[PDB]
Ligand SMILES: *[C@@H](N[C@H](CCCCN)C(=O)O)c1c(COP(=O)(O)O)cnc(C)c1O
Ligand SMILES: *[C@@H](N[C@H](CCCCN)C(=O)O)c1c(COP(=O)(O)O)cnc(C)c1O
Ligand SMILES: [Cl-]
Ligand SMILES: [Cl-]
Ligand code: NA
């Protein structure tokens with residue numbers, strides 16, 4: 012029943028403003044960390060994202076508390092999740108480390124104040140220039156993804172006379188088929204010879220094995236099975252090769268709740284429901300590692316969990332229309348109420364390209380019943396630019412009183428939402444605002460200007 | 473049979489270098505307009521796109537020749553397809569007009585030398601500032617997408633005391649449901665009152681009606697049926713309102729061949745096969761318009777057809793690995809040869825997000841049989857960043873002699889491929905090179921630098 016769907020969604024709405032650590036209401040408006048989001052969107056041009064340093068801190072606390080049973084745990088935020096410098100700074104100030112996924116990500120982590128010993132550099136394509144930059148900066152780990160890349164690591168560490176610290180990425184076949192569907196890592200069967208080669212290299216230091224299971228993983232079993240494979244091989248290689256590993260790096264993949272009404276959801280069928288918590292991830296990993304060693308360092312690489320819940324996208328309702336389907340005799344078959352916001356898939360890419368659900372509310376009318384079925388469209392000149400991941404099918408719920416000028420909020424908009432923006436239609440990539448630990452706001456990324464649209468081009472004026 | 477697939481693909485390869493108006497071979501390498509693309513990729517850092525001014529000109533000729541039966545045809549390149557200034561300049565110098573999809577697109581079209589009377593501004597969200605800029609610049613057309621937007625056009629044109637020239641966009645119900653699936657335009661039922669209202673406005677001039685059917689449309693029927701609706705309503709409104717329309721704007725959607733072996737394809741099932749040519753589009757449109765008037769101006773808005781065939785993405789094979797699935801006795805079930813190029817979906821977005829096929833060849837070994845099944849991966853730290861739209865399933869064909877350092881070419885890479893790039897993983901958006909009419913090359917867009925990417929951020933140190 013759609014009445015039951017509407018009732019349930021309004022129960023969720025009420026829970027945002029009465030039972031959510033991030034949110035409040037004031038003057039009829041949604042507030043984030045005490046900041047009125049309607050008011051904030053009158054001071055900065057929409058669309059823009061607003062991040063919460065308090066919520067990032069809460070997320071990091073969940074992750075670290077989860078690993079209390081293993082003292083020697085090192086946490087590296089996967090910076091491909093969000094690398095706006097002010098977000099990286101909040102993460103650095105919250106006391107964890109950083110994982111980087113390109114030369115420029117390494118450089119920005121160093122610039123914002125992560126030390127070399129707080130940085131892991133991962134990748135399937137690490138060109139000589141990338142490896143030379145990483146090795147020269149004394150990174151804590153550079154993963155080894157292939158035998159071809161390892162030849163460059165050997166040659167460049169020799170040229171620099173500088174030790175490269177490495178972890179060998181192994182991707183276990185844990186039942187998709189690994190050889191067909193996992194481009195990353197080496198096969199389990201190649202780990203021994205790879206480690207053998209590294210031991211003999213004068214400037215390459217083997218620190219352990221590495222894996223990464225995936226993203227938004229709704230079950231603990233894959234982490235447990237894959238960690239066991241890497242643990243069993245670590246234990247075996249210690250005996251065969253006569254070494255003691257510094258660490259094991261188990262990657263990321265802790266899910267974030269994108270739908271909260273867990274009683275109504277099956278995470279295995281709809282992974283917008285978070286199937287597990289950080290504690291479940293930690294229990295699975297730590298249990299497997301401790302079957303081998305309790306003293307070894309465990310490295311983790313959470314991305315999504317650090318920032319996903321910690322931002323809201325604010326976008327203004329900028330136009331409206333009613334479209335009507337008529338039958339062949341001119342009688343109404345249905346009306347569709349379209350609301351157009353100033354953010355489309357060029358601003359919130361995963362809503363379109365990855366069928367990602369985010370809660371949508373009228374932030375200007377947050378205490379009003381969301382009692383009208385509407386379709387929510389973006390501003391791109393593209394028939395596919397509307398939000399298909401609705402409350403019911405492709406339909407959302409907003410107050411029937413919704414007006415052009417109101418501010419719509421997408422919740423849980425903090426992971427994989429900034430660097431994935433485009434200038435399609437030459438609409439600018441968005442500004443980003445930060446709410447600090449004191450509840451004060453500041454701009455941390457400007458909106459792309461016109462001069463930004465053309466400065467990259469070379470043309471006679 | 474896969475031998476037949478391999479034989480067919482190699483026949484296609486031979487037709488590229490011995491049959492295609494764009495390409496030749498020299499020194500074993502793919503040439504585009506006589507430019508050796510292996511050599512070019514040693515002069516500019518990969519990945520980058522190279523555009524051909526000669527091929528843009530050929531595409532425009534096809535479009536304009538198709539409309540020979542209707543002298544008063546005005547052609548507007550849909551600049552959301554590609555708005556790199558050097559590409560826009562080639563299109564301007566080839567003698568056609570420009571359609572724009574945001575305030576900044578209007579501005580860049582004016583900057584590069586399109587006059588106001590050569591610019592159409594379309595959109596579903598045209599905010600007051602957008603409309604004021606457009607009206608102040610005397611645009612040939614601003615479409616009217618909604619009644620709400622029309623109120624701003626009336627108020628702003630009055631404020632400026634400048635006539636706004638408009639076309640009313642009407643989206644016909646041509647049989648899944650226009651009201652549910654088409655966010656753009658007014659309903660046919662609203663056209664009459666909307667036009668009557670415009671006639672009464674002192675600073676708004678009604679030019680005609682507008683539609684746009686869609687993109688990569690593989691049949692002529694949707695264009696004929698939709699044009700007839702617009703033509704019938706135009707003729708009816710001329711009588712009812714006592715006016716003579718300047719024009720009718722029938723939009724874009726002429727497809728481009730992404731697979732060429734039409735004898736093996738069903739365009740209605742796989743629209744990488746172009747189901748129609750520009751001549752088919754023009755026949756359908758012109759036939760319907762001439763049932764009303766032969767003197768009226770027909771406006772068309774081709775995007776994809778102007779540039780799609782006119783660029784190649786050049787990307788270097790930057791790593792390689794073999795993965796093997798073993799049975800439980802250690803015997804080999806299969807091997808997978810992974811080749812990694814330095815372009816992934818952040819560079820060629822539609823290959824991932826829209827399941828778009830592009831021909832892939834080894835440009836460095838273009839005269840060699842492409843006789844080895846490989847999987848082609850990008851450099852992003854994302855298991856999904858590999859090219860799934862293969863020659864057979866997810867598998868591509870390259871010479872068994874392929875080596876790291878070879879240059880891979882993606883053909884037909886000129887539509888919707890530049891502005892859709894991202895800085896995911898902080899890999900830079902690509903440079904762009906142009907081959908001019910004289911066959912000489914120049915950089916027309918730089919690769920994003922480290923600076924460029926961090927300079928939008930506001931941070932302490
Ligand atoms: C990132 N995970 C990648 C990319 C996920 C999809 C992004 N649109 C994957 O292979 O799934 C990644 C992480 C962080 O993962 P989270 O899911 O915790 O954010 C950690 N380590 C590595 C090596 C990654 O690539
Ligand atoms: C463009 N309309 C889009 C094109 C597809 C975008 C895919 N990322 C659609 O969804 O139909 C457009 C054009 C040009 O269309 P082409 O297919 O010829 O490039 C012309 N007129 C208008 C009003 C458009 O929006
Ligand atoms: Cl840590
Ligand atoms: Cl023209
Ligand atoms: Na606004």
Ligand code: NA
Nearest residue numbers: 209210212215
């Ligand atoms: Na060594």
Ligand code: NA
Nearest residue numbers: 517518519788
């Ligand atoms: Na290169």
Ligand code: NA
Nearest residue numbers: 670671673676
């Ligand atoms: Na008028």
